Amino acid sequence: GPVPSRARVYTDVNTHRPREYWDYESHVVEWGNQDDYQLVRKLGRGKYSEVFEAINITNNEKVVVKILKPVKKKKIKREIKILENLRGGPNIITLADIVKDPVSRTPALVFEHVNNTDFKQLYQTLTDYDIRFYMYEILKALDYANSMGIMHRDVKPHNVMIDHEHRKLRLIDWGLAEFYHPGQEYNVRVASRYFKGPELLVDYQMYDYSLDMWSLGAMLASMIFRKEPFFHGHDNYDQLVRIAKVLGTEDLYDYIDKYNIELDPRFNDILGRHSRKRWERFVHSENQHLVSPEALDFLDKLLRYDHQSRLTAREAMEHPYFYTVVK
Numbered sequence: 001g002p003v004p005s006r007a008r009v010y011t012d013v014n015t016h017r018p019r020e021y022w023d024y025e026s027h028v029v030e031w032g033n034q035d036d037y038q039l040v041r042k043l044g045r046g047k048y049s050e051v052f053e054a055i056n057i058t059n060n061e062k063v064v065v066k067i068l069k070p071v072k073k074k075k076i077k078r079e080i081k082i083l084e085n086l087r088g089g090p091n092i093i094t095l096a097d098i099v100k101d102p103v104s105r106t107p108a109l110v111f112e113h114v115n116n117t118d119f120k121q122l123y124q125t126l127t128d129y130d131i132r133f134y135m136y137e138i139l140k141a142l143d144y145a146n147s148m149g150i151m152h153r154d155v156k157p158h159n160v161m162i163d164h165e166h167r168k169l170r171l172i173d174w175g176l177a178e179f180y181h182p183g184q185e186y187n188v189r190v191a192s193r194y195f196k197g198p199e200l201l202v203d204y205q206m207y208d209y210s211l212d213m214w215s216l217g218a219m220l221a222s223m224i225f226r227k228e229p230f231f232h233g234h235d236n237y238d239q240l241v242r243i244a245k246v247l248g249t250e251d252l253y254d255y256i257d258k259y260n261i262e263l264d265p266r267f268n269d270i271l272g273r274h275s276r277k278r279w280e281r282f283v284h285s286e287n288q289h290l291v292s293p294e295a296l297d298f299l300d301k302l303l304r305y306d307h308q309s310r311l312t313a314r315e316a317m318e319h320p321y322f323y324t325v326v327k
Contacts, residue, residue, distance in 0.1 A: 007208035013149035024081035034099035062113040091141040119157035141171040143313035155215035194229035210307040217302030248276030255305035
């Protein structure tokens with residue numbers, strides 16, 4: 001069967017924790033006062049919750065309220081525990097409170113407010129420098145989470161809140177995030193299609209933090225090449241084919257061969273044979289100002305089939321691409 005895999009970093013952080021740190025099932029929620037908060041506007045509704053702009057009349061500050069749908073009964077304590085574990089970390093969204101919504105009769109998570117600009121309108125204007133700046137900020141969040149034994153598993157532009165005016169960034173929606181336990185098998189039905197790592201698409205369950213570095217790379221590619229999304233699959237199968245048309249099929253087979261993975265036989269008729277492409281073919285007059293040798297090398301080291309070969313978040317922060325960013 002499949003060969004096992006372990007993260008190359010932060011492998012044993014949770015094993016050296018009291019059970020309570022990662023045992024989210026046993027967590028006892030501290031409930032706040034629902035009447036502290038007044039809902040102002042509905043912002044949106046995801047699969048697992050409805051999201052509101054609200055006000056915290058106890059102090060009068062603006063907050064964000066995520067009223068959890070009757071979800072997968074236990075995603076709740078997982079998200080709460082992860083949020084509490086990561087609170088105060090660099091660019092980690094701050095859980096301000098947890099209350100019981102009187103109408104939904106479900107938990108309502110209360111967050112810090114962030115003044116975001118739609119990523120679409122936002123990415124059409126970001127300069128080269130600003131791409132680097134904000135990527136570095138995202139990496140701080142990811143490395144922090146990983147050092148705390150947690151992977152986000154849903155990195156995508158919609159989950160990065162950016163207050164461009166204040167050049168402030170927050171990584172949000174930790175509802176899919178998990179504790180990393182070496183040797184543990186995970187659900188491959190995580191992340192959004194265009195940001196799913198090859199490991200998910202070939203149904204390899206023993207993945208780790210490095211999943212999010214693929215997603216970050218897919219984000220970066222869309223930004224520096226001005227192509228949304230960069231890997232544009234019709235479904236999860238076509239998604240892998242779109243990746244293979246860039247990274248090539250030989251390295252794909254090397255990957256699944258290394259882990260003794262067998263592709264779904266439905267790929268036989270659709271995968272074809274594809275050479276690895278040089279990144280220069282995606283450069284054109286409209287995106288050239290966003291591209292540099294450093295950008296391409298950085299991208300190249302994120303977008304690897306083999307999850308074990310990708311840059312870790314810390315290694316990524318060491319890359320020459322970020323030398324120009326003021327620290």
